[PDB]
Amino acid sequence: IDYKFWYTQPVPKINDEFNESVNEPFISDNKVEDVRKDEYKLPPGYSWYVCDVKDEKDRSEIYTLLTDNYVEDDDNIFRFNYSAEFLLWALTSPNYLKTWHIGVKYDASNKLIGFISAIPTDICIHKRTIKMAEVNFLCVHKTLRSKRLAPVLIKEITRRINLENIWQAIYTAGVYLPKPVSDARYYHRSINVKKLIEIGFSSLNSRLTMSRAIKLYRVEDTLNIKNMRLMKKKDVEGVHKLLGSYLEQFNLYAVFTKEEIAHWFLPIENVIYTYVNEENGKIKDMISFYSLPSQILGNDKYSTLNAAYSFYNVTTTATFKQLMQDAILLAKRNNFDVFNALEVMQNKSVFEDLKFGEGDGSLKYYLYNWKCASFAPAHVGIVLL
Ligand SMILES: CCCCCCCCCCCCCC(=O)CSCCNC(=O)CCNC(=O)[C@H](O)C(C)(C)COP(=O)(O)OP(=O)(O)OC[C@H]1O[C@@H](n2cnc3c(N)ncnc32)[C@H](O)[C@@H]1OP(=O)(O)O
Ligand SMILES: CCOC(=O)c1cnc2ccc(OC)cc2c1SCCC#N
Ligand SMILES: [Cl-]
Ligand SMILES: [Mg+2]
């Protein structure tokens, strides 16, 4: 492809490769005073809108746009269906900016037809910590595709981020764009196998009959780490220490403050689940996963796939395998149908033993305005929503 938008942006060209001695911006010495103060032009009949995600009705508009128009799998079986409470959690992290939650309305109907968002975070890339924006939830209504609206949303959010003297961003996508810093496949561990077969995701064969599949994926309802329990506010200092220490080994990770640990990990039912093991007043192990249902397109029995996605997991008292077997059990106890994980951090090491299957996509990780060496996905230490 020609990437005629992306080639105007400060990202690597498709054949660029940089060695470990290079870890810097494409464009440095940027000046906030020089940033354009005018909003980017939209086509006639469309207007910018600043969404207030803490207002239930604006949030509901974003929820409806994404439910009807967001990411589908390659096979068009599923569309992601982030909940409105999830959107509130994802977008109102510490020191978030309302003005980075950008909608576009079609004036004649007053309906939201496009969205993009970012939140601020400190990202460590090859041992250099940089303030970045983490961009997510880019969406154009399905009736307005291939009209070049996405570059207008990208340029408008870049402008507003640059007004805060932030000049780098991190983002992920299942599409290939110039140019990933790493690329991680999805893997899935079936929990409710019969439902996964019925909706057309999992398969059977003459060796693996339905009863044999159910037995294969059966799990014992006993934790390997007996005192794993939901995280509470008392555990924030300990989680900050256990996770922060663990993440320092990776080539790309977020540098969480204590306030960020409280926001990203304290549990919210049907949104984020974090469990900890406390021994002697120290947090020695943690499991976390978030809820991301998919709408099952056209299905008359099931409308929703409830899926848990692995977030951050660290063990110092058990094996990683035993930890992840406990995460699958915790997701099963919370009614999830499947447990999904990327091949980042230590995860790929347990996929075969814990009977995960390889999915069809991969998720590519990108930086904006940063040149550096790429690296294998076990050296990625960040999970975006
Ligand atoms: C310093 C601050 C920096 C801040 C900004 C950082 C960068 C943030 C970047 C955003 C990160 C978002 C991360 C995130 O949200 C997580 S990835 C999920 C993105 N959302 C979806 O896939 C939802 C369903 N699809 C859509 O809504 C549309 O297809 C979208 C809106 C995706 C494209 O709408 P469209 O109607 O299909 O297409 P046009 O308007 O005609 O636009 C065509 C151009 O858009 C480029 N494109 C397509 N998909 C992209 C994607 N996923 N990222 C980046 N760029 C993407 C494409 O390559 C082409 O450019 P090119 O001609 O050069 O090839
Ligand atoms: C059954 C296992 O879960 C998925 O395969 C799944 C479900 N819903 C989606 C909706 C949109 C979608 O867009 C790529 C993918 C999925 C996927 S695969 C990649 C995410 C994971 N795991
Ligand atoms: Cl322009
Ligand atoms: Mg378009």
Residue numbers in the entry: 26 to 410
Sentences from the paper on this structure:
N-Myristoyltransferase (NMT, EC 2.3.1.97) catalyses the transfer of the fatty acid chain C14:0 from myristoyl coenzyme A (MyrCoA) to the N-terminal glycine residue of substrate proteins. This co- and post-translational modification is ubiquitous in eukaryotic organisms and plays a central role in a variety of cellular processes such as the addressing and reversible anchoring of proteins to membranes. In particular, NMT has been validated as a pharmacological target in fungal infections, in a range of parasitic diseases caused by Trypanosoma,7Leishmania8 and Plasmodium protozoa and filarial nematodes, and as a potential target for the treatment of cancer. Herein, we report the synthesis and the structure-guided optimization of a series of quinolines with balanced activity against both Plasmodium vivax and Plasmodium falciparum N-myristoyltransferase (NMT).
First, compound 1 was co-crystallized with PvNMT and S-(2-oxo)pentadecyl-coenzyme A, a non-hydrolysable myristoyl-coenzyme A analogue,26 and the structure of the resulting ternary complex was solved by X-ray crystallography. Overall, 1 adopts a binding mode similar to the original hit compound, 3-butyl-4-((2-cyanoethyl)thio)-6-methoxy-2-methylquinoline (MRT00057965), which we identified in 2012 by high throughput screening. The quinoline fits into a hydrophobic pocket, where it establishes parallel-displaced π–π stacking interactions with the adjacent side-chains of Phe103 and Phe105. The binding of the quinoline ring is reinforced by the establishment of an H-bond between its nitrogen and the hydroxyl function of Ser319. Additionally, the nitrile function of the 2-cyanoethylthioether chain appears to interact with the imidazole ring of His213 (distance ∼3.0 Å). The ligand is modelled bound to the protein at half maximal occupancy due to the low affinity of binding. This is mirrored in the two orientations of residues His213 and Tyr211, corresponding to the bound and free forms. Interestingly, the ester function, introduced to improve the solubility and log P of the hit compound, also establishes polar interactions with PvNMT, through water-mediated H-bonds. The X-ray structure of the complex between 1 and PvNMT shows that a cluster of water molecules surrounds the sulfur atom of the thioether chain. Superposition of the three quinoline–PvNMT complexes present in the asymmetric unit of the crystal shows that the ethyl ester group is flexible and able to adopt different conformations in a relatively large pocket, suggesting that the ethyl chain is suboptimal and that the enzyme may tolerate larger substituents.
